[PDB]
Amino acid sequence: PTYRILKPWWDVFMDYLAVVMLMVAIFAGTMQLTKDQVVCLPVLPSDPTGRKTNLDFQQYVFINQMCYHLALPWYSKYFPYLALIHTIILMVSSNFWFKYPKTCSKVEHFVSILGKCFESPWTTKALSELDKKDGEQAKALFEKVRKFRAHVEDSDLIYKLYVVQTLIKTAKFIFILCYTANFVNAISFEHVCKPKVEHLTGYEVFECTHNMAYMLKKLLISYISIICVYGFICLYTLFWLFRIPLKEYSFEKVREESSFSDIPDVKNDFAFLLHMVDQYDQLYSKRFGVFLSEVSENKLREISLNHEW
Amino acid sequence: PTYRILKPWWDVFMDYLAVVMLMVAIFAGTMQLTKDQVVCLPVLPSDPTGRKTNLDFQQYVFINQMCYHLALPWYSKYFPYLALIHTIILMVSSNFWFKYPKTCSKVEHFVSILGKCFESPWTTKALSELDKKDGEQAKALFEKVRKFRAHVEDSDLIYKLYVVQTLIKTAKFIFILCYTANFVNAISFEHVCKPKVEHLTGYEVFECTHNMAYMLKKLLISYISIICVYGFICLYTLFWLFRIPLKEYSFEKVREESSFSDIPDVKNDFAFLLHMVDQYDQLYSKRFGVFLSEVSENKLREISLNHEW
Amino acid sequence: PAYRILKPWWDVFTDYISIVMLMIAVFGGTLQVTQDKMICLPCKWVTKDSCNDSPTGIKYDLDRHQYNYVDAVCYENRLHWFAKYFPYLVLLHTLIFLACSNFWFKFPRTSSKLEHFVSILLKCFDSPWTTRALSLDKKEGEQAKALFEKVKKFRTHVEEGDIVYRLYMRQTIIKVIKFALIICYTVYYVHNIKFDVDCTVDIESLTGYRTYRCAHPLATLFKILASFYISLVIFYGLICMYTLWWMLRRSLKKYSFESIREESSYSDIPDVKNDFAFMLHLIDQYDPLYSKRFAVFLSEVSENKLRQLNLNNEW
Amino acid sequence: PAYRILKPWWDVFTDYISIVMLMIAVFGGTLQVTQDKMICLPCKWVTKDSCNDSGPTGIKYDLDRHQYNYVDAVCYENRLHWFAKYFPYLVLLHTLIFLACSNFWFKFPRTSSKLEHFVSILLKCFDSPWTTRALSLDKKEGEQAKALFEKVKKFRTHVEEGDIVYRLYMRQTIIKVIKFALIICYTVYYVHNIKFDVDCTVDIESLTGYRTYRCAHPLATLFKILASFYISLVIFYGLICMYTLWWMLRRSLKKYSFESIREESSYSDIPDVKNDFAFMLHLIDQYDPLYSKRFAVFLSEVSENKLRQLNLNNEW
Amino acid sequence: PAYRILKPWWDVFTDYISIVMLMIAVFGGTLQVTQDKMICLPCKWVTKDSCNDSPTGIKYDLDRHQYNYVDAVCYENRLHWFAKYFPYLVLLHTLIFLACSNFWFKFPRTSSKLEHFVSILLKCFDSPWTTRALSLDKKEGEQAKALFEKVKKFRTHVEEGDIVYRLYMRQTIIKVIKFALIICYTVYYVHNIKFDVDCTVDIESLTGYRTYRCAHPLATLFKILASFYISLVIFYGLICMYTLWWMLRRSLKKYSFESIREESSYSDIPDVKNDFAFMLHLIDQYDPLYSKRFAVFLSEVSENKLRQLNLNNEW
Amino acid sequence: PAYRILKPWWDVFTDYISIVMLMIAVFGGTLQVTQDKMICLPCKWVTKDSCNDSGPTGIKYDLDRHQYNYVDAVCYENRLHWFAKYFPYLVLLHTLIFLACSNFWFKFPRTSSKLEHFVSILLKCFDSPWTTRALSLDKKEGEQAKALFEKVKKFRTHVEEGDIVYRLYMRQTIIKVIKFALIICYTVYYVHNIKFDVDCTVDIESLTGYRTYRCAHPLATLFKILASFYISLVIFYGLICMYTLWWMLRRSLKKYSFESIREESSYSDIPDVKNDFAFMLHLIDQYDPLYSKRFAVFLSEVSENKLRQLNLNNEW
Numbered sequence A, B: 001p002t003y004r005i006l007k008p009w010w011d012v013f014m015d016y017l018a019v020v021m022l023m024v025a026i027f028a029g030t031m032q033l034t035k036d037q038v039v040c041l042p043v044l045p046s047d048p049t050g051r052k053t054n055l056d057f058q059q060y061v062f063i064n065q066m067c068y069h070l071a072l073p074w075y076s077k078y079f080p081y082l083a084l085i086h087t088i089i090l091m092v093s094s095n096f097w098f099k100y101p102k103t104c105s106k107v108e109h110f111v112s113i114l115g116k117c118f119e120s121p122w123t124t125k126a127l128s129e130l131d132k133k134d135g136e137q138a139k140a141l142f143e144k145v146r147k148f149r150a151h152v153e154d155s156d157l158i159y160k161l162y163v164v165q166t167l168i169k170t171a172k173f174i175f176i177l178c179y180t181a182n183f184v185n186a187i188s189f190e191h192v193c194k195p196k197v198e199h200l201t202g203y204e205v206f207e208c209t210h211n212m213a214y215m216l217k218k219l220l221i222s223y224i225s226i227i228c229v230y231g232f233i234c235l236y237t238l239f240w241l242f243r244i245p246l247k248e249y250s251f252e253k254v255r256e257e258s259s260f261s262d263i264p265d266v267k268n269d270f271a272f273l274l275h276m277v278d279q280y281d282q283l284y285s286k287r288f289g290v291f292l293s294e295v296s297e298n299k300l301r302e303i304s305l306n307h308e309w
Numbered sequence C, E: 001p002a003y004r005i006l007k008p009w010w011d012v013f014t015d016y017i018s019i020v021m022l023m024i025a026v027f028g029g030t031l032q033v034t035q036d037k038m039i040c041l042p043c044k045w046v047t048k049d050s051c052n053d054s055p056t057g058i059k060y061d062l063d064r065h066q067y068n069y070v071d072a073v074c075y076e077n078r079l080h081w082f083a084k085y086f087p088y089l090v091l092l093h094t095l096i097f098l099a100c101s102n103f104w105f106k107f108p109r110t111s112s113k114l115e116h117f118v119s120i121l122l123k124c125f126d127s128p129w130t131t132r133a134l135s136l137d138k139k140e141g142e143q144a145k146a147l148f149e150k151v152k153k154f155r156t157h158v159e160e161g162d163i164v165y166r167l168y169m170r171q172t173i174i175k176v177i178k179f180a181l182i183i184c185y186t187v188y189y190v191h192n193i194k195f196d197v198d199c200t201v202d203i204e205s206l207t208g209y210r211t212y213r214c215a216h217p218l219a220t221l222f223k224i225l226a227s228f229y230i231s232l233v234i235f236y237g238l239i240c241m242y243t244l245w246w247m248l249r250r251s252l253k254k255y256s257f258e259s260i261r262e263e264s265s266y267s268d269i270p271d272v273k274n275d276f277a278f279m280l281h282l283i284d285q286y287d288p289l290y291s292k293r294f295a296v297f298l299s300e301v302s303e304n305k306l307r308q309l310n311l312n313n314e315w
Numbered sequence D, F: 001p002a003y004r005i006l007k008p009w010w011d012v013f014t015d016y017i018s019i020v021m022l023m024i025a026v027f028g029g030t031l032q033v034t035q036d037k038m039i040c041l042p043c044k045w046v047t048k049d050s051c052n053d054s055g056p057t058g059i060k061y062d063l064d065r066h067q068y069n070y071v072d073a074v075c076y077e078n079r080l081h082w083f084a085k086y087f088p089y090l091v092l093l094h095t096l097i098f099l100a101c102s103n104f105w106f107k108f109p110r111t112s113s114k115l116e117h118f119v120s121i122l123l124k125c126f127d128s129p130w131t132t133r134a135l136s137l138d139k140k141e142g143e144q145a146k147a148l149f150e151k152v153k154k155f156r157t158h159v160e161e162g163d164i165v166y167r168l169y170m171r172q173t174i175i176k177v178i179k180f181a182l183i184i185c186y187t188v189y190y191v192h193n194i195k196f197d198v199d200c201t202v203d204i205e206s207l208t209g210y211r212t213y214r215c216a217h218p219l220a221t222l223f224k225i226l227a228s229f230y231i232s233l234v235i236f237y238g239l240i241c242m243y244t245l246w247w248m249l250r251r252s253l254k255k256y257s258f259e260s261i262r263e264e265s266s267y268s269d270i271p272d273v274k275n276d277f278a279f280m281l282h283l284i285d286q287y288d289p290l291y292s293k294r295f296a297v298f299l300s301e302v303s304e305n306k307l308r309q310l311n312l313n314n315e316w
């Protein structure tokens, strides 16, 4: 959909980290559905030989299942699902600012007019210092730009939505990290089970080993590292957002670089989109700056009059 | 098929919730076919040591299967299939509008004419208030659009179908919420099974544990929560959008804003489809209103004549 | 593609029902390969003909492979063939229904005729001459004349044959006959999907017991799927019988433009016959607008007006 | 795509039967890999080469789990018929051979080039407005029609010499029909060996202790059903191929006559094409005669003379 | 895409044989990962070197995990590496064959040259100037002039270098050497895939038995797959040797238009050298029509007639 | 797509080697998840820290099935070397690092925008008929050539001032080669730990009764084969990366000379670019010199003067 222009480098990094986290969560869930089980043996009372526990195979399976659903902690068996939920939430928040129909229409119109202005030879002609069809197309594009400016600057939906998105991402990162750091060393290979099934088997205390414990711990460590990198990127994004006020865009640099100084101060969501484009590439921002100048409008009118007369 | 214009934001949210519910149902069915089983041990009569039940492994498997059939309730084993059926029903009720060819032809024709009723430069010119050849080309478009207006202003099929579909959605949500909330605490990890197979194994009473008991409970809670959110969205939609009838969409705000105040009062399914686009994007509604105004059509023909003087 | 305009609502409903039946067949076949088996325990009290009813566990002195052999034998001999082969029969029925539904779309003569009809309908629907008449460049006029000539060639070529109507009628008859056979044999054979089966396979020389009490695990799920498939077949047969009644209630080989000729100013449109009439009836079932637009090219008065306008813009 | 005009009803039926048999082969191969085993129990009372048959209590064989697994593996490898074991592999090989014999002329360049050239030229002639005008102008349309006439003449004088496509199609049909004959012989003759219960005498007495075992093949009935279905599909495929061969040998396909077209139309000077051109036109006739009637315009000399007259008329 | 004209019939045959070999490799690897194992029973009579052959079942007093350990050890040690690693070697050989066959399509110099040649040939084949010469607008004339200039630039760029023919020859030599090595080592090591294998792993301190008689369930299936792979390798090597003989029988670095210039209206087309000759030979192997039509742009008389026609339509 | 001009032969070889290594990593990870286990048997006669090894009859350990499973799981998680358990995950991480280092400059916008603009400009200049005319017109062609000349001048004055792409490529090459060095150190050092038989002393005598167990690792040989193959592939990858770094550091890539082009062509006033433009031109020359020779026309002032003269000629 050619939406990569609106996505800066930190947005791309967040998208790739979200994809990696989703892959990790899917792999962990597949392991949880594949070979997640515990192996439990009863604690017998005090030439080597084996100890006969007098337990059948299905009694052992019953003990394993009971201690898996009672003795094994919730974070040792529901971690991949929580990770999947977190990745889904982050992916939805990342894609939320261009999925709402009003904001989607606004950004689609912005992308269309930016592509028109970038490929318009009139901007190149204005920067260097024609044809009647080119002049008419330039006038139509000027009218579309004026209509877009009158249509977008009144509202502040996109900027507020992006602020809500990044605040939600930061709060979710803080909550996930705080709630995850408490369950790092808690995941252990060995466990003690007291399931109160002495009337079915005859043993009170069992010792269990969780098969998917150390691998789950390593996946947890990797997920913690990746989410810490994601949180650092989110903090940098918030610092960039709060560094320069994006509510208005000053075209002093644009009007000084260009030969036309009649460039108005774009504010609100249009200014936010221009800031995102400038963080992506300054060429489109220069095209929009030179296409917002009234001196260029006078030059286009004079060229059209010379063509007609 | 460019049907996102037809779908408002609440329809998209409900479709995404239905997709999530379908994914949850498929996941639950995969777990049901993967590792859904019950482990049963007989209740034996009254230096710890194991209790020998004197049962073969195949006797244990027979006991497990018989208690799965008898002791386990139906909603604890056939929940994912019912969830899948409900998701399919909701998705069909969300998609039957364009599946039916009779409604599909009208919808396609409306979308096709709506494409030209807004993209045309005359729409922009009327919004502000170009060649006479463009006016001559738009004369046939105006004639075809008025023919469509006459053709659909006496038909109520689309609005009736949409109202029936959303009423079915609301009733299905109510039924699903009621029965799911009824069947919450009945699902239990432990069961007391009396399969009456004493002549085959020697034991009358067995104690069973369902392997996918807590996980199915968590999935049931998640499904109930998603159903509640979906129903809240649907009820808000029926409380605001469909509480005021949409068969009439006589342009009032548009005729206030537009200079061409005499806009025809198109009704029935054409007005309902215009209301859908209005709930999608108000810019499309404005350009339609400034374009489809009868005074604006006469002004288009007059301007073509003026340029052809 | 563009063939979707030839399918009425009942054809789309049959396609969706067949897709759901195919999903049921895939689900049942996956269950048959994966989880379908038998679990059998011998009965040591066989006083009656079947297993007889008569604490500590009962010891049968049977190994694991003896149990597996008993399960396999009582799954082979004394299990009803419907429970074992339900999804395969459903898959075969879906294959037959899909072959019958899409036979005319793949038979070369009828496929060529339908493609030509669709192409000509698309040409006539987007033709500006119809928009002009129902309410102009010379290239548009000569293209309209060429389209008129092609319409006349289509009318003189397709109306002679009768392969499309005969093939569609044969497809409907085969579909309803297959529905009748399914609704008979599946219903007559749905009571044999029992959870518990008392088998007597006479393998006493290998195991030691004559009769066994097996329990089919997927019997309840297979019964549920069989009931769902019976309901789907009932809906499919109702749709097919409605289609057959629609075909046989009136001569689809004769189509009248009386309403269309009274609606417009052209009252010389003749009645079309055979495959042309049948395809126009299908179009009316889909959308009468296409046939209303196409009826312009079948009138001599429209051709006279077209050449009159050609002479008018020429001079 | 555009090659659907080159496939008559018999070709479409054979393609669909090949697809069905291919999916049957895939399903059978999945079953053979996954579930195909042989549950064996020893016979304590042996009186002949095969196993003998002679409250109740179970029989104790004093065999471990791995002894049972070894007995299963050995009696599955040795005393189970190869047809039951390797049925879906044979079906897959036969379907691959049939698909190769169906798509060889499409994939072999010496005939693929001729087929694509003929398809492109026939599609351009079917969409040519000159055919519509003649069966009942712009200078650009006239010169395009003249260029297409020259292209048709060049293609006719280039492809009418050799007959590689007809020969290749005949060879493919002969290979397919003889393949069907061999399949319906060897599959019908070897279908009785797919039985549920097989007695084995594999002589592993020094490892297990028993001489003869009786084994149950769980997938024997399903493989027998698949074999019967595959035999029925092979019978239908062979009947279709026999009809195709009879159609090819009934009349010469290297001699195409426009007698019906020249009787219907005014142009009664249409030449008779031969070799690959006649065979491809006969395939078109079996597909749809409208394409052949439309293409017959470009072969008559009267149409070319009228086109020259119109080109002279619009040249000045 | 458009590279299909550069592949002769033998290249297509090698590609399809490599596809079938890859399918065999995938199937064998799936079998190896899924169901490849051994079933070992100890031999209690070890009078001879191997198992000695000498009613109630024999009791070995071994647990299930002891049997699993014996199977794992005798599968690791006393099973030949060919039966264990047949599909992995087949997969590696198929990857090598696919890399060698498609090496010139990914090497940047040869890939760029081949893409330029294909684009120029496609432009020349659809040029109406060639059709007019073998049997008019000024824009067509200037397009033909530009195409002629591009053909001249391509000829003076490609005739200097000779890397495409060298790369193709090296690929063919590497492929035939790999085929020789495969046909040697696979055939020499194909009789070691035995169903019954006698192992002596010396695990008496853990089990109590010295020698075991294991059964390899997938040994016969792997032998059948090995025979099929050997047959495919033989066909592949025969095709590769045919290609090598075709390259070495005549100097493909020199291409002549003698028959073409006798057939065509121009008798001035010069003989080309180096990679241009090899590419024209490949096009001849694909279809002589393309080279016959492309030979127009290589003649000076064609350029003279083109500019004469340009001057004629100019005035 | 259009980025193939930015990938020389070493880049394509490294990409294919990375693809093969990623495939090996996926296969090894699938084996580790599914088929990786450990079969342990106790040693009743123990004389040291490790296990002691010394008609026939079997040895009975009096251990249940789940006691064996517990021993297997404990000795698999405790006394198995970390490299055997985590080999494919480390290989997957290394392949991901290599792919990220290969695609970072394509995904980082500050270099991606410049690279895609350069690719588009080079493609437009290579297809321009003005270049063909100059190396050997209509007013539309002349004005398009003039607009492309102005675009090339703006691109040169915009890109040549910065050298971010060259710095990023150098950093990527350095990271790749040092990662190869670390891999070829640590993987080779820990390649001896993937052995078949491992002795464990996990001290579970209070549950099972035995102290030391001998365990067999079924996937030891296959993991060792995968490790050897991955080591060989990483050796080839490191050799190619060393060649790439040697090529980068052999001569100054931030100064491109058109001496060969200005000697071959009549234009002897082509300016010498620097920073990213010189490096991109060197990459194009390593891909194919025809693109660089065709693009060199748009830099000479004599070609611009001739274009202006032709524009003046067609203007009046």
Ligand SMILES: CCCCCCCC/C=C\CCCCCCCC(=O)OC[C@H](COP(=O)(O)OCCN)OC(=O)CCCCCCC/C=C\CCCCCCCC
Pocket: C025, C026, C029, C030, C033, C034, C035, C036, C037, C091, D023, D025, D026, D027, D028, D029, D030, D033, D034, D035, D088, D089, D092, E027, E030, E034
């Ligand atoms: C020559 C043809 C080759 C075809 C391909 C062959 C190789 C296939 C590749 C991989 C499959 C490997 C085996 C399955 C993967 C998991 C490993 C494994 O061992 O699984 C075993 C496990 C069975 O466990 P058991 O306990 O033995 O079952 C009960 C036995 N009494 O396998 C499975 O569960 C899956 C087996 C079925 C797979 C799918 C088969 C096809 C599905 C449905 C067929 C019916 C509907 C067909 C609809 C067609 C519509 C066009």
Ligand SMILES: CCCCCCCC/C=C\CCCCCCCC(=O)OC[C@H](COP(=O)(O)OCCN)OC(=O)CCCCCCC/C=C\CCCCCCCC
Pocket: A027, A030, A031, A034, A035, E026, E029, E030, E033, E034, E035, E036, E037, E091, F025, F026, F027, F028, F029, F030, F033, F034, F035, F036, F088, F089, F092, F218
């Ligand atoms: C590191 C990258 C990411 C890797 C991600 C991997 C995710 C894997 C996820 C899920 C796997 C689920 C498998 C099925 C459920 C588990 C079943 C189970 O426990 O099976 C165990 C059991 C282990 O063997 P045993 O039967 O015990 O016999 C041998 C004893 N020594 O599994 C099996 O037998 C069946 C194995 C099924 C999987 C087979 C996978 C095969 C993979 C590749 C084959 C080769 C492909 C080559 C492609 C080449 C392309 C050019």
